[PDB]
Design a protein around this nucleic acid. Structure first.
Ligand code: ZN
Lengths: 185, 86, 117, 71, 121, 74, 183
RNA sequence: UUGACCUCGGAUCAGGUAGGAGGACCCGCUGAACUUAAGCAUAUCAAUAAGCGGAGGAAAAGAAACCAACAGGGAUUGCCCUAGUAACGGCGAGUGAAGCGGCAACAGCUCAAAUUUGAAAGCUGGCUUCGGCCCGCGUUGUAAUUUGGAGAGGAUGCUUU
């Protein structure tokens, strides 16, 4: 019959291979992702705490420059970058960690759920590194973290943390240890 | 499902069958991550830069001030002025 | 011992005096570039390793950091004022330290240091 | 060799290289050493006349009488 | 027939074109009629050929000077208007690129430069 | 005939059947050259021809590979 | 941060996670071209410690090399063969380094970090522009990479007496009859 | 329905680069036989010749996972002696170094493993009135700081541009 292109066949066969092999638990834990509602709540908070784009940064710096020509507190933003976020988790500064599920060299993030479990930081696996990228004005973002916030929504952050630790961490608690996949049947 | 996909699965699975062990796929026991680390791993001091305003932004702002004083760049106008001008 | 083709690998030395002239002119060029400075750097006195040559001493590679600190010469200024520094050597005894420290203060006693500008 | 035979029979000129050395053999400028440097004297004799040391290392051969430059 | 060079340097493009045209027509006519009784026509033919060479040289020089005046601030020039040098000389690092240093090296060279000194005998 | 004219070296050594020159190897980019024949290497060496461009390089080197015109030129 | 963890993981290549990932990747690479452009390094810790930077002018190229003997053994390493094949495909680039990424029953897969010497981002950086000099043309062909440095025996010590400065230069030095003027 | 991301392609799109020559010297790969041993096969020839690939005005090597056993030396290279010594060998033919010592020349450095996190501070292109404006790369990490005979952070008081 008709012939499919080669890279499309590679994509679909990589699908079937990654879903129907006996996957180790460290990799099989990434198939369990946040629901729609909890991801929406988390992204509402993280959209409240987005960083500034280049245009806003230059605009603000021009404003301070002309104010000097003619007082501030510490800025609170979503923290990103893999090594930076790992350093924040290790020093117990991060409060909530959101890890993308489609990092192509998956070794860069396999130790991250275990690390968050060890240091005690609440974590959740989200659908899409491109979603985390839009939040930080980049194309993609392997992981984001929130450490501290402004006063007016601290309670909200706390509730969100409790939400994931009641809504994602205990639904993952038993299946985070088990091998995934298989063709038994 | 189909025979070709299952043949591919069986090929890469036979590439990953350890037959010398009774249980090749055991449950993960969290012998390390079950205990919680209460303190940070680093005992290094925090640099004073994390408590004081930014110095790189201070240098950038002074460079901008020097640029405005030479008239090289245009000063700040609030966005409503730019809207009513254009 | 002429088993191999030694004809293709005979090195004569008819250019020995010409190479001596070249070396002397290279030293003159070094003198022209470094006009009041000596063409050589100061090097420490070291003892020869083996038991056969233990009795005699020779010139080393560079002064130890402890020797420079004891002589009163800072580490970063030393290569810029004609002293060689070797970070690998260790003193290991109070007798090489004293000798090279004496050498360094003797060098300091006979040095004319000029200001930067 | 064939190239050199070609240039011998060619009307193209022989490009003479000036003797431009990479390093100057005499100090130059308006400093003290330049106005007292004798171009017909060696390094050791010039540094002897200056009253300075030319080589800080160990003596490597015999010296002329009144060397005072090779310490 | 024979034209000096500075007179050609004074004139403009359309003028130099019309001397080019008249010299070419004269050369063509003399080449046609030169097949019989070639006497003093040979020296005139040689001088006319040299004259066409001079006129073409002057128009080419003026055109390339105008083209170089066009491309004074533009980033890319045509390959005919670029210096030849050699292939390796065109590929080596630029003087601004080769003399660049790191900031650590610049700091070390700024605060601890090579000093002037003299050991007295 | 066995051999015809070659475009590269201009000799009648291009094999009429194999279409490969016996002197230079025309379809190959590299000119055929062997170290067991010094005479063959000196019959086609750099210097046995016209030197249209390589003879102009030393004079350009002598003046520093400079551009422009002398001052006061017309 | 994370690169320390990746280095420790790369040090356990038969553990379940790394074995699973190596097999899935080997399957994909086997069905790709012999020499193919890699968008990003599969081992970022290894590429980063070998001098790879996420900057325009840096390129990864994965290459498969048939493994086994040439009982005459090929004195050339399989890693050296990989760099040479990639260096011919990318004749405008300079081979910086390379590293093992995978191995199969019939092939050994390597990733070669290359550098563009004509990009302005490389020519302006004093940390990498040494490769812009023409003495670094085809370092993989002259034994000037890491595999070349190992195979030529360029180490200090009594064990490397005949090869530490070049084997053939040492042989020519030892087989030269020096006759001086005054004999 | 629409818009990201990722991956794989097309373009006579824009800017570049490689090929060939030369090859005395240099860096690799590959690699003989005659001959000697009054025969000859181990050996020698020779890690040579031929063959293949890759540079420069030099190349290569190079700042110790070194030498040493010392009262210690101190990146690399080359000359002299070491020394026809040690070592290996139908222990025959023979093969055959190196440390130390004297000299020539000397010069040291850059990264990876750190969170800038009180602010990607970094860079390639295009447009230019050439002064500063856009798109892009990049957080799966571009600047600064640091490179283990080190270093960082605070405090401290001098000294440097
Ligand atoms: Zn031919």
């Amino acid at each position: 019959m008709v012939k499919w292109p080669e890279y499309i066949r590679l994509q679909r066969q990589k699908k079937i291979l990654r879903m129907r092999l006996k996957v180790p638990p460290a990799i099989a834990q990434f198939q369990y992702t946040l629901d729609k509602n909890l991801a929406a709540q988390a992204f509402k908070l993280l959209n409240k705490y987005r960083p500034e784009t280049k245009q806003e940064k230059k605009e603000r710096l021009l404003r301070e420059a002309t104010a000097i020509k003619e007082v501030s507190k510490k800025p609170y933003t979503v923290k990103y970058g893999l090594n930076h976020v790992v350093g924040l988790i290790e020093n117990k500064k991060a409060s909530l960690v959101l890890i993308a599920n489609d990092v192509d060299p998956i070794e860069l993030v396999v130790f991250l759920p275990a690390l968050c479990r060890k240091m005690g930081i609440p974590y959740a696996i989200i659908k899409g590194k491109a979603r985390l990228g839009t939040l930080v004005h980049k194309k993609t973002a392997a992981v984001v973290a929130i450490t501290e916030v402004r006063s007016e929504d601290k309670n909200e952050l706390a509730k969100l943390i409790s939400a994931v630790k009641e809504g994602y961490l205990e639904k993952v608690e038993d299946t985070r240890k088990r091998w995934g996949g298989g063709i038994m049947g | 499902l189909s025979r070709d996909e299952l043949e591919l699965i069986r090929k890469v699975q036979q590439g990953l069958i350890p037959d010398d062990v009774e249980d090749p796929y055991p449950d993960t026991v969290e012998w390390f991550t079950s205990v919680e680390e209460k303190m940070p791993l680093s005992a290094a001091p925090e640099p004073k830069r994390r408590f004081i305003p930014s110095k790189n932004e201070a240098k950038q702002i002074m460079k901008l001030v020097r640029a405005i004083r030479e008239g090289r760049i245009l000063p700040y106008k609030p966005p409503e002025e730019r809207e009513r001008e254009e | 011992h002429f088993r191999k083709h030694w004809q293709r690998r005979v090195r004569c030395h008819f250019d020995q005096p010409g190479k001596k002239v070249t070396r002397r002119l290279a030293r003159r060029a070094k003198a022209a570039a470094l006009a009041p400075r000596p063409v050589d750097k100061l090097r420490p006195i070291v003892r020869c390793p083996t038991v056969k040559y233990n009795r005699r001493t020779r010139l080393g590679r560079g002064f130890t950091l402890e020797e420079l600190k004891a002589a009163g010469i800072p580490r970063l200024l030393a290569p810029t004022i004609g002293i060689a520094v070797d970070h690998r050597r260790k003193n290991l005894s109070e007798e090489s330290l004293a000798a090279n420290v004496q050498r360094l203060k003797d060098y300091k006693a006979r040095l004319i240091l000029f200001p930067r500008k | 060799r064939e190239l050199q035979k070609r240039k011998r029979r060619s009307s193209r000129p022989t490009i003479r290289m000036p003797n431009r050395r990479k390093k100057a053999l005499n100090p130059a400028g308006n400093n003290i050493i330049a106005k007292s440097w004798n171009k017909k004297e060696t390094l050791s004799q010039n540094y002897t006349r200056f009253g300075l040391v030319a080589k800080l290392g160990k003596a490597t051969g015999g010296t002329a009488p009144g060397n005072k430059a090779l310490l | 027939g024979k034209v000096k060079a500075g007179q050609l340097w004074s004139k403009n493009k359309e003028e130099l074109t019309k001397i080019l045209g008249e010299l070419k027509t004269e050369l063509s006519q003399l080449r046609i009629q030169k097949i019989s009784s070639s006497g003093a026509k040979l020296n005139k033919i040689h001088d006319l050929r040299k004259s066409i060479a001079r006129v073409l040289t002057v128009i080419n020089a003026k055109q390339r000077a105008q083209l170089r005046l066009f491309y004074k601030n533009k980033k890319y020039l045509p390959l005919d208007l670029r210096p030849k040098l050699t292939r390796a000389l065109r590929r080596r690092l630029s003087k601004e690129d080769a003399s660049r240093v790191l900031e650590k090296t610049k700091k070390r060279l700024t605060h601890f430069p090579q000093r002037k000194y003299a050991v007295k005998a | 005939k066995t051999h015809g004219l070659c475009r590269r070296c201009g000799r009648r050594s291009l094999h009429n059947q194999k279409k490969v020159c016996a002197s230079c190897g025309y379809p190959a980019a590299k000119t055929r050259k062997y170290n067991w024949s010094e005479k063959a290497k000196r019959r086609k060496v750099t210097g046995t021809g016209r030197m249209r461009y390589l003879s102009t390089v030393p004079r350009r080197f002598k003046n520093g590979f400079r551009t422009g015109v002398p001052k006061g030129a017309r | 941060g994370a690169l320390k963890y990746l280095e420790e993981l790369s040090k356990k290549k038969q553990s379940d996670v790394v074995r699973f990932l190596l097999r899935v990747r080997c399957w994909e690479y086997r069905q790709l071209n012999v020499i193919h452009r890699a968008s990003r390094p599969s081992r970022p810790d290894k590429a980063r410690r070998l001098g790879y930077k996420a900057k325009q002018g840096y390129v990864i190229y994965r290459v498969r090399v048939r493994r086994g003997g040439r009982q005459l053994k090929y004195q050339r390493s399989l890693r050296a063969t990989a760099e040479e094949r990639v260096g011919r495909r990318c004749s405008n680039l300079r081979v910086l380094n390379s590293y093992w990424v995978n191995q199969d029953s019939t092939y050994k897969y390597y990733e070669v970090i290359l550098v563009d010497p004509n990009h302005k981002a490389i020519r302006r950086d004093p940390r990498i522009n040494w490769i812009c000099n023409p003495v670094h043309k085809h370092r993989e062909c002259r034994g000037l990479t890491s595999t070349g440095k190992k195979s030529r025996g360029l180490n200090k010590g009594h064990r490397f007496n005949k090869t530490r400065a070049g084997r053939r230069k040492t042989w020519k030095r030892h087989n030269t009859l020096s006759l001086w003027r005054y004999r």
